[PDB]
């Protein structure tokens, strides 16, 4: 059919608000019903999903840190630990600030000199 609603066997049920997984489809007597995402899960989009997504993990073993928690409609945001930096565009893993010129930053690396 149209936005904020999807189609099934022949009837169109509406999606679920960004923050609620899908439970059951709609019929000829009752419509699509949805319960909210856990207190560690989320769904950032008018979905029709049956399982929410789990909040991203800022595994400390990799040198990350919870930069910003995640609501029931936004995933968590990670960043390196002070003294660490990302190992590529996407901050997958962090490394300890190499020491011995210009210092380093959350994503920046340091540069030595005499």
């Amino acid at each position: 059919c149209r936005e904020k609603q999807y189609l099934i066997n022949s009837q169109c049920c509406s999606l679920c608000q960004p923050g609620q997984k899908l439970v059951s489809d709609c019929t000829e007597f009752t419509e699509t019903e949805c319960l909210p995402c856990g207190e560690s899960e989320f769904l950032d989009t008018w979905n029709r999903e049956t399982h929410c997504h789990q909040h991203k993990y800022c595994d400390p073993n990799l040198g990350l840190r919870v930069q910003q928690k995640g609501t029931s409609e936004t995933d968590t945001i990670c960043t390196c630990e002070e003294g660490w930096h990302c190992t590529s565009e996407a901050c997958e893993s962090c490394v300890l600030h190499r020491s011995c010129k210009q210092i380093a930053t959350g994503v920046s690396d340091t540069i030595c000199e005499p």
């Binding site: 856990g38 560690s40 899960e41 399982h51 929410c52 997504h53 789990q54 991203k56 993990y57 595994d59 073993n61 990799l62 040198g63 190992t87 893993s93 962090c94 490394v95």
Partner: protein, 135 residues
Amino acid sequence: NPQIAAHVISEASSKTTSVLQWAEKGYYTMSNNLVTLENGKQLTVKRQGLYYIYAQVTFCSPFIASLCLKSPGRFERILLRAANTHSSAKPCGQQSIHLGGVFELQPGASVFVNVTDPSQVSHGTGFTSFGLLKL
């Protein structure tokens, strides 16, 4: 539902135990009230039978994920144990371990994963899971 099956997601832990924590979040599965997640530390089936249980543990470094089983009226034991040797890498290097086998479970019996360094198990989405299904 008629089929008894369950797949749970690993979760960090505030306590210090070497017994891994599992939460019914993410893309989890818990077929019905015949398999529950007792105290969030182990799976407990209600109907006696022959299940296939499994569990994958990913840690970032002699790391050993054991699947000790606790049955009613019997001292818990050991269903499986998978070892792994700590290899070097930039921060810690990741490693996954997979366990799985067919076992006879009696009602009220619980299974659980128990690692040697719970402070290394990486909890990133989809890295560490635990589950079982009834044949």
